[PDB]
């Protein structure tokens, strides 16, 4: 008779693409073990039998100290051990986030290390954590790293923001690798290099660290992350709380759950370029090849003759301009295919493709399946 | 020279997974299209040069009109052609949503409906809309259609909206389908049902709106649904907002999206069982198959003796009670594989299978690829 029931208190945030995969663990955890609990996502701020918690949250902490049932913080690792919660503790690794992110740019011939991160101000101790993990595997390169705190997540002064930051990315010498804090930051980044029409990443390549699509700004330029294991540590902390339930001793669990992978996209996307004209025209290239765009405007992009900048883009590329326009129509098309939704009637037409059948010809010869055949093994 | 931005404001609500596909879409023009925009999510409550926002809300109608700049609302749609508001709209069909609910429950034999809502009381013109679409397409079954508006979507008195919930729910016939108005409705039904015991599917048949999971109740049956046609929905808004940037003519759109399809789940697996003590010893052992139960836990959750209860399972299910548990452990097994990102070595553990090649033995046997093979073809 499984007549017994808990209620289980949830505390995270719905909005945020992390906390929203804790929950979705949690979740799983319910499904395998088809527990009789009854789960609220209560957070806003009655208790129930057993707590799990965003940790990273001092005012949490705060409110849970002193709380008699069970309880298991989730929330971001720290350096020193003393500086973790008095609680059951779930925790992303701060250190192989960032170590993931610098071992994607290190791969990618990248030896110029930045890292744009969160004011002390903010009470964001994940942050200071993930700039002393860079500061820590930055060490030995061969040019030293970069720091630069933000000024605030909500600035007080959005516009004196914007200048600072472009101040700060105009210092920065082509084939620097940027390393931010969390996607949000990443995309602050992006929406700068927007305005003053920065190539990234043929000039300054960005990284993020939550694999978030739903930041406060929506960036062009797709947007490379790493994955937290942020579902796992949900399902771990559900596990637990069971265990916990059961009325079982422990001492206080400190179990550090690693980044799922990188995602690499386009704003990674480096291949050894150097030539500044060649970067500025790349760049131009792979914003609008599908908007049906000729060498000419190549060539206004940058202030440049037809002559001077074939030659820089053969010296680079092997390729001609030309060539390079149509190559880069073909991957918009690919990625539109591997990374949403769309038909690919419409992937075709908004590539600039004149009909479904050419561009159904042109991909067959660069890839050997079709749009349809590599969709199936290759999406998301 | 692609140097106009357009700074581009979204009006909706990060926490709710209908209102992030939206804002997904928008995000795939951006990928597809390559605009020069700098949009933001902005939404709590400058504003910029286009708007695209969430219409289900008189507030953010009230605040819009009379601005000067493009707007595309996006909401529910309406039976009465002059009930949508004075600007472009992107519509779901509330109508096909509810009717693709209704089809699915048609085609499991289901021909007793039922239709949990929500009150006048709260602003919800969708609700009132799917209502009256259940109503229509009702009409012509055997048995009438019985609709329950709930109290409120946060109530005022929990634990008296619970017991109303609970009194009508035990008013509902065997074999009673039932289509809530939103996931979240739907999941406040399953836990009334958890409370309570009563069976889903077996004997009350549940499904849902949104194809949420995190919604504020979770739930240990896994919920069908209807999932909205919500990415395509912010796509269409973004690409009608671009060509409304250009400053294009055109009488005041009224677009119907259709939902995707029904993610059918186990809240409306109903296989045709109509023996009482069959229902609730099948929902008993489809809890806790996975637990390693005897058939003796299932002869005392029913009050039965093993003969007559043996007896029934022949005659509904042809299957022995030993064999019902056991096809059910593998099942439990099935979902998670396809429903969940766990590894196949905790499915099979929490499954309560004693080795992973046990399980693996009895997977290859039931279906002919093996756990690992099912889940690349069958995953999501
Ligand atoms: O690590 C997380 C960070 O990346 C951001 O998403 O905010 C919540 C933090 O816990
Ligand atoms: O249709 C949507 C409904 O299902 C719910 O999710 O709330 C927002 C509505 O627009």
Same mark, same amino acid.
């Given at each position: 008779?499984?007549?017994?029931?808990?209620?289980?208190?949830?505390?995270?945030?719905?909005?945020?693409?992390?906390?929203?995969?804790?929950?979705?663990?949690?979740?799983?955890?319910?499904?395998?073990?088809?527990?009789?609990?009854?789960?609220?996502? /209560?957070?806003?701020?009655?208790?129930?039998?057993?707590?799990?918690?965003?940790?990273?949250?001092?005012?949490?902490?705060?409110?849970?100290?002193?709380?008699?049932?069970?309880?298991?913080?989730?929330?971001?690792?720290?350096?020193?051990?003393?500086?973790?919660?008095?609680?059951?503790?779930?925790?992303?690794?701060?250190?192989?986030?960032?170590?993931?992110?610098?071992?994607?740019?290190?791969?990618?011939?990248?030896?110029?290390?930045?890292?744009?991160?969160?004011?002390?101000?903010?009470?964001?101790?994940?942050?200071?954590?993930?700039?002393?993990?860079?500061?820590?595997?930055?060490?030995?390169?061969?040019?030293?790293?970069?720091?630069?705190?933000?000024?605030?997540?909500?600035?007080?002064?959005?516009? =004196?923001?914007?200048?600072?930051?472009?101040?700060?990315?105009?210092?920065?010498?082509?084939?620097?690798?940027?390393?931010?804090?969390?996607?949000?930051?990443?995309?602050?980044?992006?929406?700068?290099? /927007? =305005?003053? =029409?920065?190539?990234?990443?043929?000039?300054?390549?960005?990284?993020?660290?939550?694999?978030?699509?739903?930041?406060?700004?929506?960036?062009?330029?797709?947007?490379?992350?790493?994955?937290?294991?942020?579902?796992?540590?949900?399902?771990?902390?559900?596990?637990?709380? =069971?265990?916990?339930?059961?009325?079982?001793?422990?001492?206080?669990?400190?179990?550090?759950?690693?980044?799922?992978?990188?995602?690499?996209?386009?704003?990674?996307?480096?291949?050894?370029?150097?030539?500044?004209?060649?970067?500025?025209?790349?760049?131009?290239?792979?914003?609008?090849?599908?908007?049906?765009?000729?060498?000419?405007?190549?060539?206004?992009?940058?202030?440049?003759?037809?002559?001077?900048?074939?030659?820089?883009?053969?010296? /680079?590329?092997? /390729?001609?301009?030309?060539?390079?326009?149509?190559?880069?129509?073909?991957?918009?098309?690919?990625?539109?295919?591997?990374?949403?939704?769309?038909?690919?009637?419409?992937?075709?037409?908004?590539?600039?493709?004149?009909?479904?059948?050419?561009?159904?010809?042109?991909?067959?010869?660069?890839?050997?399946?079709?749009?349809?055949?590599?969709?199936?093994?290759?999406?998301?």
């Amino acid at each position: 008779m499984f007549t017994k029931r808990h209620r289980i208190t949830l505390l995270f945030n719905a909005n945020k693409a992390y906390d929203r995969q804790v929950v979705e663990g949690v979740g799983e955890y319910l499904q395998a073990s088809q527990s009789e609990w009854d789960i609220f996502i /209560e957070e806003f701020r009655w208790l129930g039998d057993g707590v799990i918690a965003d940790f990273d949250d001092k005012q949490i902490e705060q409110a849970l100290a002193d709380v008699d049932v069970p309880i298991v913080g989730v929330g971001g690792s720290y350096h020193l051990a003393e500086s973790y919660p008095p609680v059951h503790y779930i925790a992303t690794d701060n250190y192989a986030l960032v170590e993931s992110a610098f071992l994607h740019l290190k791969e990618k011939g990248v030896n110029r290390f930045a890292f744009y991160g969160l004011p002390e101000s903010s009470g964001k101790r994940w942050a200071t954590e993930r700039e002393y993990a860079f500061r820590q595997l930055v060490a030995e390169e061969k040019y030293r790293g970069v720091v630069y705190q933000g000024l605030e997540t909500a600035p007080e002064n959005w516009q =004196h923001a914007q200048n600072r930051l472009a101040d700060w990315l105009q210092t920065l010498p082509p084939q620097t690798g940027i390393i931010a804090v969390t996607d949000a930051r990443a995309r602050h980044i992006l929406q700068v290099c /927007e =305005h003053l =029409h920065i190539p990234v990443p043929e000039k300054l390549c960005v990284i993020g660290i939550d694999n978030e699509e739903l930041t406060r700004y929506l960036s062009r330029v797709a947007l490379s992350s790493v994955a937290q294991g942020a579902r796992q540590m949900g399902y771990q902390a559900a596990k637990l709380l =069971h265990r916990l339930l059961d009325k079982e001793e422990m001492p206080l669990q400190r179990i550090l759950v690693p980044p799922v992978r990188v995602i690499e996209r386009r704003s990674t996307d480096y291949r050894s370029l150097t030539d500044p004209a060649v970067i500025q025209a790349m760049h131009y290239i792979r914003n609008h090849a599908c908007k049906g765009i000729k060498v000419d405007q190549v060539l206004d992009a940058v202030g440049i003759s037809r002559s001077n900048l074939e030659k820089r883009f053969k010296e /680079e590329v092997g /390729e001609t301009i030309h060539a390079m326009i149509h190559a880069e129509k073909l991957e918009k098309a690919r990625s539109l295919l591997i990374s949403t939704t769309l038909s690919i009637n419409e992937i075709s037409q908004m590539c600039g493709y004149p009909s479904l059948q050419y561009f159904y010809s042109v991909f067959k010869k660069a890839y050997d399946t079709t749009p349809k055949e590599y969709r199936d093994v290759n999406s998301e």
